[PDB]
Design a protein around this nucleic acid. Structure first.
Length: 49
RNA sequence: UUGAUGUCACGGAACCUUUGUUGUCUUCGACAUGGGUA
């Protein structure tokens, strides 16, 4: 038993997004991935392009 | 397209340094033209 709460966020400013990286590099040892953890994330449909 | 008992990323000024500068009197006299004649 759960209740779903529809959430929308309206940005009043340009928001920051983090650069895409390989799933091999999405760990605490990669500085760039950790530094961008508070930003938005880009999703790739396919890893190649 | 996240994972969860732990995110100061509003935690970080694209910032700092380079002269569109230099040189020149709005001045002034000899031609122009191609043959023609035998």
């Amino acid at each position: 038993m759960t209740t779903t709460m529809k959430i929308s966020i309206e940005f009043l400013e340009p928001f920051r997004m983090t650069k895409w990286q390989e799933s091999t590099r999405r760990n605490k040892n990669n500085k760039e991935f950790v530094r961008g953890q508070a930003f938005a994330r880009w999703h790739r449909n396919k890893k190649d392009n």
